[PDB]
């Protein structure tokens with residue numbers, strides 16, 4: 001299965017910057033969401049979940065086809081709550097109806113990371129909507145009540161190695177868990193992208209508790225939480241080393257997250273040798289907007 005990137009006809013960097021800016025301005029405007037977290041974190045999670053269906057073995061799933069728009073995938077229990085991100089993006093899509101769905105969902109995550117003061121994430125256009133029959137079945141996204149060996153095996157399907165896994169999970173500095181979505185509750189409610197995930201893992205005093213859904217999670221007295229799969233990153237000695245690295249080097253974390261997150265968003269896509277180079281969007285702040 002080959003998915004060849006095809007640039008939306010006649011579009012260039014300055015078209016996609018406009019879309020980025022519309023997303024970014026709406027992120028600033030719609031600030032009340034989720035007790036004043038705003039939509040940044042949910043957009044990052046949307047971009048990940050639309051990408052994380054990918055299977056390297058047969059090139060099924062992935063961001064290219066925009067298949068989250070279809071009910072089988074929209075309704076995946078693993079995607080509960082992401083409808084809020086889709087609803088955020090609907091006026092953006094109405095303004096810019098020429099962008100493909102996969103391009104919009106992936107660009108929403110890039111825009112969110114950058115506007116939350118995270119790294120620059122180079123981004124490539126040309127995902128093409130594919131039909132409803134190409135929608136992957138539910139069950140391809142990961143469970144949270146598992147251990148490091150589970151996490152490591154899971155991510156091999158996505159062609160991610162230990163460093164890439166640990167870097168990607170730093171996104172768990174953002175937003176929160178919600179009991180009614182996933183059966184986990186709590187988190188920093190943070191809407192600034194930092195390396196805090198790693199510092200919290202190493203620094204807090206964690207206790208293994210049960211939540212009101214009868215699931216185990218790690219809680220800190222400071223009011224933070226970790227999923228079992230997050231905590232596994234300090235139980236496994238290989239992950240632990242990388243957690244320490246990122247807890248001690250903000251810039252390295254930023255660079256490695258950027259590389260892994262673009263990768264994630266590009267898995268499954270064949271870019272022609274003459275395709276445009278990746279775009280690096282300016283933030284609103286860099287534009288004086």
Ligand code: HEM
Nearest residue numbers: 041042044045048142143144168171175176177178181182
């Ligand atoms: C083993 C891998 C992972 C597991 C098991 C996992 C699981 C979860 C769960 C259970 C939630 C809470 C959802 C809710 O209740 O609303 C969540 C939230 C979140 N996840 Fe992950 N995740 C994983 C990897 C990732 C990766 C790779 C990223 C992106 C790079 C990511 C980004 C997010 C973000 C940003 C949120 C917060 C959403 C919000 O505040 O609404 N996750 N994740």
Ligand SMILES: Nc1cccc(N)n1
Nearest residue numbers: 172174175176187226
């Ligand atoms: N904010 C957040 C989201 C997912 C998992 C964790 N540990 N925390």
